[PDB]
Amino acid sequence: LTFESTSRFAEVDVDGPLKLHYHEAGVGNDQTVVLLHGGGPGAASWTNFSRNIAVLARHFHVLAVDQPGYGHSDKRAEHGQFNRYAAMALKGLFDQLGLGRVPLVGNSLGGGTAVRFALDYPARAGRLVLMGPGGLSINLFAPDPTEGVKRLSKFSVAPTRENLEAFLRVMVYDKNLITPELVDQRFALASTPESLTATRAMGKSFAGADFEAGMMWREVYRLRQPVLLIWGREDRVNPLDGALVALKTIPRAQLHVFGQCGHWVQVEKFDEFNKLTIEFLGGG
Amino acid sequence: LTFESTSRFAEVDVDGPLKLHYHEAGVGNDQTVVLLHGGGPGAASWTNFSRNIAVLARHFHVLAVDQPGYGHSDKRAEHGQFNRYAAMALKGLFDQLGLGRVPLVGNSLGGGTAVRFALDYPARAGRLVLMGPGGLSINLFAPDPTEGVKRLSKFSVAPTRENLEAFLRVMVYDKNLITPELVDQRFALASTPESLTATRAMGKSFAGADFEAGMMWREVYRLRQPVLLIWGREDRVNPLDGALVALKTIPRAQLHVFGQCGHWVQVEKFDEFNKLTIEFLGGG
Amino acid sequence: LTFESTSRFAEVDVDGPLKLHYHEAGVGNDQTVVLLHGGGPGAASWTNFSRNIAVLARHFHVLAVDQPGYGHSDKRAEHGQFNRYAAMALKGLFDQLGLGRVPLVGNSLGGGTAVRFALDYPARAGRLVLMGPGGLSINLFAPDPTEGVKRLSKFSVAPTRENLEAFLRVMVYDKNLITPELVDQRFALASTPESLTATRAMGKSFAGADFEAGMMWREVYRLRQPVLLIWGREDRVNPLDGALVALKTIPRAQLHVFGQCGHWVQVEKFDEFNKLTIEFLGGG
Amino acid sequence: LTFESTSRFAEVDVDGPLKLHYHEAGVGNDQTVVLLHGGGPGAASWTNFSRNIAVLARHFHVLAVDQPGYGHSDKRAEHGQFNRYAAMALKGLFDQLGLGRVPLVGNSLGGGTAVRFALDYPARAGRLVLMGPGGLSINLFAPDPTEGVKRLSKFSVAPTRENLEAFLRVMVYDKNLITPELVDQRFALASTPESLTATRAMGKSFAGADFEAGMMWREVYRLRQPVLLIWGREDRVNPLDGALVALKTIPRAQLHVFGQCGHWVQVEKFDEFNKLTIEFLGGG
């Protein structure tokens, strides 16, 4: 399996034509699962889920979607509440590919998008796996913005290699995962004017009149499906106190917490996450 | 596998001879695991772990021990801090069977015993799996005693079938698990004068000068092994707020929480618990 | 100051005529404050707050209102979501008495009423003091229903003296404040057939399709005034973990917790409660 | 009242002569109270509490002690666990001045000192007021080190004006209280080479084999006096989740949280803090 062999585009109508890049793998398998990546500068599906797609594709028909503003998907300068916008695009894509009810796996921003999809198109989302997700998280103890969110903001105002490395280093518990190569790859994608356009837009997108659509912790008591929340204990972007409203109010919630793990569970605990996800979504 | 085929006794010296009943299964398998049951009136290994022993014995050499005061183990009228007393007996048993370093799985009182064993005989305990455990739990929000602990106390003062059924019903989320048969079986064992002797003794045992040995949440920062905490979200004996000090202070802690699950995870979520335990202890 | 000397009535319109009973004291004091009692059986303004009123009336013009269904207020057999019903009744009373913007003090159900009033009529609510309040409380760790709520439901199905006693005993840390007289007084008021119809009416309302208006933890991020949350550490009805969402999301929140105090803060910490309320509402 | 008019010195014995500087005010007031400042760079009694002292001295005989390593107290290059070292120093001062049992008010490091003093010399500590205290705080949800602790360590490795400014900005909610003057004042006191040796000494002590004496969350169940915990909701050094163990396990605890307040409660909520302290220590 490669970036190139798995690569696909579709066009959907979200207030006009919108190009979506996605990867597709395990076309043999009956059970489709959609993967939505995290929302850090230069993130995309292939790199966010590089320790996961090969393993999951042995069990499931994998659709790993570059959310609008990321990877090879369109990067408009203007859009409404990000997770609602990404959810509309994904819904466009589900209609185009003929999908009915499909489980979703989402990290950080992608977990926000998964939850917003599942609330707006309730019959279309099956079981959710959400790792350190935004939107349904409300940090009952951590003063906002968190150290992770501050570093992301500092990069958007001053997009240097140094500010990106400082942001990546609060993503993980073990700093040695943030290798000179990783930083070079992410910085190369993040620093394009198209990406910085997207990165700005996404910032503004959260502080408007539809901020209510970002407070998904008010709405997840309505989710009827099983939902696996996965968190690193040392997550410094969306800390662990942000799991508590969702775990209480989602009737069929489960929570797994990993000690010695930051915001990137799917990377730092890839094997345990792969096995939780495979088991939770039914072995395929 | 049966109660009778698996049954074993040993004698160990804990301030004088002490008869221990245990079950042994999967004698073919290299990896030994010890199972310690919960501490409710009439609990014993075989019934506490009846949805678990057969599955676990396919992977591991299972030693499911009736703690002192329970099952077919001696029921002395007098003993010190219960978990320390049960830990000394288990340590006696490890020396007798030639065990070195062995993983432990423990529910409620049994989790207390596992943790006290792991602190007092640190080189002798491998990975721990603890479900709704006593001792390391400190209920930061729930006023003590909890509804579960009150019902256990009311039974010890007035040991009727009605008080036992009221206690069993706050053990589980789904009340239909508390069948007329289950109540009859547990009540028959719980109501013997030997058992009520044990049940009284165990009460007194916690409120002495060595109450510090029961506050294991002060000492688990010293545990060096991986530790899987498993909780039901609706546990009304040792509520979920009681997981927080252990999850924070145990360096290699993990936490799994099941929605729609009470104090008896190994029963109400038997399949998910069996698979967590098998995976966490290395597949065997 | 007596029940009779302070006793007042006003007729307001909520789907027709509605008789409201209230107590008035400290007439001529510059600052008016409205007290709203809790939802326990036979609860009323004068029994809930009798001692606190004499003290607050030294500083404030106190209006202590019997909520619809309680004390000498109308006890209809049916109504919508209680807190919006009680808040409309209260709005009627504010309009009739020409009250502008007034601080509100509420215990349990009355705290929810105060909050629903402060969200629906924002310009009419001043500073809020909420003791162990309903509606904006969401027990993130305590399984629902709590011990206190279960003993309230039990009384409501089997309205005996002995079930009322069981309920009152989990309102307080010091069970000696539950005198044979207090039981007799409250049993007398709770067991009249109109009060019984008012508690059967309360049943259907909280269990009915207008439940979202009860979930004010979703809404209190709109409150613009200072809010003082007051909690007994040992509250067994609305436990301390229910404070966390309101404390996080109300911009100008404060929380005060008293050790060795149940749900009835205004009784068990009488002095410290009066002094907090007086200082927080401005000394008068 | 001035630095010079209130300034006092006393020589006490802790592994030899130790010069302690303190401030005294409100001489002749019946009730003595000891204030203990925080551990930030260039922290001292008079800078930490200057405004609060004038107010508390209207009611109390105030002794505001510079802890060893700070202000004008001796700045040794080495010592044991700081809080037991500072508490022994304090015991020396209480013995020299013939103080019996005295209430203590402590911020951050000084709160830990107050607690260690109250556990080791139980008959000499009265009521405690602890603002965002160290030692008895255990951040159950915040990964350690916190943002505040990291900026303190950074200053300590690279003692520039700009690193001190970064530290002070995460002490407060309103970053405008961090004046160019405050920076200049604190940089002046923090950057003297003896203060530098005192912070390098502080390093080795907290990171050394005497760390268990620092973990007072394990011990505060022994405190028999009333304890008032005071917290800024937005505390980025010792965040609000660190209050929970002390609030649960101190029998006569109270907690007060202020919204829109950082770690420096005594500055950012000056009035409400003075009034709580005055009321709680008995009005004087």
Short mmCIF file of C-alpha atoms in Angstrom, two decimals, chain C residues 20-250:
data_model
loop_
_atom_site.label_atom_id
_atom_site.label_comp_id
_atom_site.label_asym_id
_atom_site.label_seq_id
_atom_site.Cartn_x
_atom_site.Cartn_y
_atom_site.Cartn_z
CA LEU C 20 -48.39 32.40 44.90
CA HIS C 21 -47.61 32.46 48.64
CA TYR C 22 -44.38 34.23 49.73
CA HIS C 23 -42.87 35.69 52.94
CA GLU C 24 -41.67 39.32 53.08
CA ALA C 25 -39.27 40.83 55.70
CA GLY C 26 -36.80 43.75 55.97
CA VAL C 27 -39.21 46.13 54.22
CA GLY C 28 -37.52 49.49 53.44
CA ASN C 29 -33.98 47.95 53.08
CA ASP C 30 -32.58 49.32 49.78
CA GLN C 31 -31.69 45.89 48.17
CA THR C 32 -34.42 43.27 47.51
CA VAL C 33 -33.39 39.54 47.33
CA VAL C 34 -35.63 36.59 46.39
CA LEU C 35 -35.15 33.22 48.14
CA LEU C 36 -36.23 29.97 46.38
CA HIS C 37 -36.53 26.79 48.56
CA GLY C 38 -35.68 23.16 47.54
CA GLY C 39 -37.92 20.42 46.06
CA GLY C 40 -37.99 17.86 48.93
CA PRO C 41 -41.47 16.66 50.16
CA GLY C 42 -43.22 19.28 52.38
CA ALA C 43 -40.50 21.81 51.48
CA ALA C 44 -41.54 25.51 51.72
CA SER C 45 -39.94 29.00 52.06
CA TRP C 46 -40.48 29.33 55.81
CA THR C 47 -39.33 25.77 56.81
CA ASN C 48 -36.35 25.92 54.36
CA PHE C 49 -35.09 29.41 55.30
CA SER C 50 -36.91 30.49 58.56
CA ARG C 51 -33.68 31.18 60.52
CA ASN C 52 -31.72 32.61 57.46
CA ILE C 53 -34.63 35.06 56.74
CA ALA C 54 -34.36 36.83 60.14
CA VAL C 55 -30.61 37.27 59.48
CA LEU C 56 -30.85 38.32 55.80
CA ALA C 57 -33.81 40.74 56.65
CA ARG C 58 -31.29 42.77 58.81
CA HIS C 59 -29.65 43.71 55.43
CA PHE C 60 -32.08 42.99 52.59
CA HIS C 61 -35.76 43.25 51.67
CA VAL C 62 -36.30 39.40 51.55
CA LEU C 63 -39.05 37.83 49.38
CA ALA C 64 -39.11 34.07 50.11
CA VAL C 65 -41.46 32.55 47.49
CA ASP C 66 -43.30 29.20 47.76
CA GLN C 67 -42.78 27.67 44.30
CA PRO C 68 -45.90 26.37 42.49
CA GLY C 69 -46.62 22.88 43.91
CA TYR C 70 -45.23 23.77 47.40
CA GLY C 71 -46.19 25.43 50.71
CA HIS C 72 -49.31 27.59 50.20
CA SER C 73 -48.78 28.19 46.44
CA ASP C 74 -51.24 26.60 43.95
CA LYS C 75 -50.67 22.78 43.51
CA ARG C 76 -51.86 22.01 39.95
CA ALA C 77 -52.16 18.35 38.79
CA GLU C 78 -50.16 19.20 35.56
CA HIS C 79 -47.63 21.80 34.14
CA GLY C 80 -44.64 21.96 31.69
CA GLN C 81 -40.94 21.63 32.69
CA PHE C 82 -41.17 22.73 36.35
CA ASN C 83 -38.30 25.23 36.30
CA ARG C 84 -39.69 27.23 33.30
CA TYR C 85 -43.22 26.99 34.91
CA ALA C 86 -41.83 28.25 38.31
CA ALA C 87 -39.75 30.95 36.46
CA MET C 88 -42.87 32.22 34.53
CA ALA C 89 -44.75 32.33 37.90
CA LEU C 90 -41.81 34.31 39.37
CA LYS C 91 -41.74 36.68 36.32
CA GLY C 92 -45.50 37.28 37.01
CA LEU C 93 -44.65 38.14 40.64
CA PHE C 94 -41.74 40.47 39.68
CA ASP C 95 -44.06 42.30 37.18
CA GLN C 96 -46.93 42.57 39.77
CA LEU C 97 -44.56 43.92 42.55
CA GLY C 98 -42.69 46.25 40.10
CA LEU C 99 -39.29 44.52 40.82
CA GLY C 100 -36.54 45.49 38.34
CA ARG C 101 -33.28 43.43 38.47
CA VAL C 102 -33.07 41.41 41.71
CA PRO C 103 -30.45 38.96 43.12
CA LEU C 104 -31.67 35.36 43.63
CA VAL C 105 -30.73 32.74 46.25
CA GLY C 106 -31.84 29.18 45.47
CA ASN C 107 -31.42 25.75 47.09
CA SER C 108 -31.69 22.53 44.88
CA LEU C 109 -34.95 22.85 42.75
CA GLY C 110 -35.10 26.60 43.61
CA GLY C 111 -31.52 27.02 42.22
CA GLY C 112 -32.67 25.52 38.92
CA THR C 113 -35.69 27.88 38.97
CA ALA C 114 -33.33 30.85 39.64
CA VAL C 115 -31.07 29.80 36.79
CA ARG C 116 -34.00 29.19 34.31
CA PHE C 117 -35.34 32.68 35.31
CA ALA C 118 -31.86 34.28 34.84
CA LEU C 119 -31.51 32.71 31.32
CA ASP C 120 -35.08 33.44 30.03
CA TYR C 121 -35.31 37.03 31.52
CA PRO C 122 -31.65 38.08 31.68
CA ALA C 123 -32.29 41.76 32.56
CA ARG C 124 -34.43 40.74 35.65
CA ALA C 125 -31.89 38.50 37.51
CA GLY C 126 -28.96 40.00 39.44
CA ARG C 127 -26.21 38.09 41.29
CA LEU C 128 -27.11 34.38 41.93
CA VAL C 129 -26.31 32.34 45.05
CA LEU C 130 -27.06 28.59 44.33
CA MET C 131 -26.76 25.95 47.14
CA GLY C 132 -26.43 22.42 45.73
CA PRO C 133 -28.56 23.46 42.77
CA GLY C 134 -30.57 21.29 40.37
CA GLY C 135 -30.63 21.78 36.60
CA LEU C 136 -27.17 23.37 36.19
CA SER C 137 -25.64 20.36 38.12
CA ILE C 138 -24.49 17.34 36.05
CA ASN C 139 -22.99 14.56 38.22
CA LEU C 140 -19.94 13.68 36.06
CA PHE C 141 -18.95 10.79 38.39
CA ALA C 142 -22.05 9.80 40.52
CA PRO C 143 -24.33 7.29 38.79
CA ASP C 144 -27.89 8.75 38.42
CA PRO C 145 -30.23 8.55 40.17
CA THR C 146 -28.20 9.36 43.31
CA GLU C 147 -29.06 8.00 46.80
CA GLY C 148 -30.91 11.21 47.65
CA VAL C 149 -32.95 11.19 44.41
CA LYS C 150 -33.87 7.43 44.89
CA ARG C 151 -35.21 8.08 48.49
CA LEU C 152 -37.22 11.03 47.11
CA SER C 153 -38.76 8.80 44.37
CA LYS C 154 -39.40 6.02 46.94
CA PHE C 155 -41.29 8.47 49.27
CA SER C 156 -43.28 9.62 46.20
CA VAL C 157 -44.44 5.99 45.42
CA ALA C 158 -44.94 5.03 49.13
CA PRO C 159 -45.59 8.27 51.07
CA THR C 160 -45.00 6.88 54.61
CA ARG C 161 -43.38 8.65 57.60
CA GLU C 162 -40.52 6.09 57.47
CA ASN C 163 -39.65 6.80 53.75
CA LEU C 164 -39.68 10.60 54.51
CA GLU C 165 -37.30 9.96 57.41
CA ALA C 166 -34.98 7.96 55.05
CA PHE C 167 -34.97 10.94 52.62
CA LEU C 168 -34.23 13.63 55.26
CA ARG C 169 -31.33 11.57 56.72
CA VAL C 170 -29.42 11.87 53.35
CA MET C 171 -29.97 15.70 53.23
CA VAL C 172 -27.49 16.29 56.12
CA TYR C 173 -24.07 15.15 57.41
CA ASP C 174 -25.23 15.28 61.08
CA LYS C 175 -28.27 12.97 61.14
CA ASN C 176 -29.20 14.38 64.62
CA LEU C 177 -30.72 17.50 62.89
CA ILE C 178 -33.49 15.07 61.70
CA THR C 179 -35.68 15.39 64.87
CA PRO C 180 -38.92 13.38 65.42
CA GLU C 181 -40.59 16.91 65.19
CA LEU C 182 -38.98 17.82 61.83
CA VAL C 183 -40.18 14.41 60.48
CA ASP C 184 -43.72 15.03 61.94
CA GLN C 185 -43.80 18.64 60.62
CA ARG C 186 -42.66 17.65 57.04
CA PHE C 187 -44.78 14.41 56.94
CA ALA C 188 -47.86 16.55 57.83
CA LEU C 189 -47.23 19.00 54.91
CA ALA C 190 -45.99 16.32 52.38
CA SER C 191 -48.87 13.80 52.93
CA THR C 192 -51.87 16.16 52.27
CA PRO C 193 -53.53 14.85 49.03
CA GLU C 194 -52.91 18.16 47.04
CA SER C 195 -49.12 18.00 47.88
CA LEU C 196 -49.23 14.31 46.75
CA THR C 197 -50.85 15.43 43.37
CA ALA C 198 -48.16 18.21 43.15
CA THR C 199 -45.33 15.53 43.54
CA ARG C 200 -47.13 13.17 41.00
CA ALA C 201 -47.32 16.30 38.67
CA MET C 202 -43.54 16.95 39.33
CA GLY C 203 -42.93 13.25 38.29
CA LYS C 204 -44.50 13.43 34.75
CA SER C 205 -42.80 16.88 34.13
CA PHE C 206 -39.12 15.83 34.78
CA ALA C 207 -39.96 12.52 32.95
CA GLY C 208 -41.58 13.97 29.75
CA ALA C 209 -40.43 15.40 26.39
CA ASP C 210 -39.61 18.96 27.87
CA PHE C 211 -36.48 17.60 29.72
CA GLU C 212 -33.87 19.69 27.67
CA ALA C 213 -35.06 22.89 29.44
CA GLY C 214 -34.00 21.05 32.69
CA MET C 215 -30.38 20.54 31.45
CA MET C 216 -29.12 24.08 32.26
CA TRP C 217 -25.43 22.92 32.45
CA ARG C 218 -25.76 23.31 28.63
CA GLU C 219 -26.78 26.98 28.94
CA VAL C 220 -25.05 28.70 31.93
CA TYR C 221 -22.14 29.97 29.71
CA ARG C 222 -24.72 32.73 28.86
CA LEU C 223 -24.96 33.98 32.55
CA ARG C 224 -23.22 37.47 32.64
CA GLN C 225 -23.61 38.18 36.38
CA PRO C 226 -21.50 36.91 39.29
CA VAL C 227 -22.69 33.48 40.47
CA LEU C 228 -21.68 31.97 43.82
CA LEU C 229 -22.06 28.16 43.89
CA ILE C 230 -22.30 26.74 47.47
CA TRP C 231 -21.88 23.02 48.16
CA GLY C 232 -21.75 20.63 51.08
CA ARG C 233 -18.84 18.23 50.46
CA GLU C 234 -21.15 15.35 51.69
CA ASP C 235 -24.20 16.31 49.54
CA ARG C 236 -25.89 12.92 48.72
CA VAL C 237 -28.65 14.43 46.47
CA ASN C 238 -26.68 16.69 44.11
CA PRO C 239 -23.09 15.63 44.87
CA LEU C 240 -20.02 17.94 44.53
CA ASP C 241 -19.04 16.54 41.03
CA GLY C 242 -22.22 18.32 39.69
CA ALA C 243 -20.59 21.78 40.36
CA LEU C 244 -17.79 21.32 37.75
CA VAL C 245 -19.53 22.29 34.45
CA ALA C 246 -21.16 25.44 35.93
CA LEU C 247 -17.87 26.42 37.67
CA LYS C 248 -15.96 26.10 34.38
CA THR C 249 -18.51 27.72 32.02
CA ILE C 250 -20.03 30.62 34.07
#
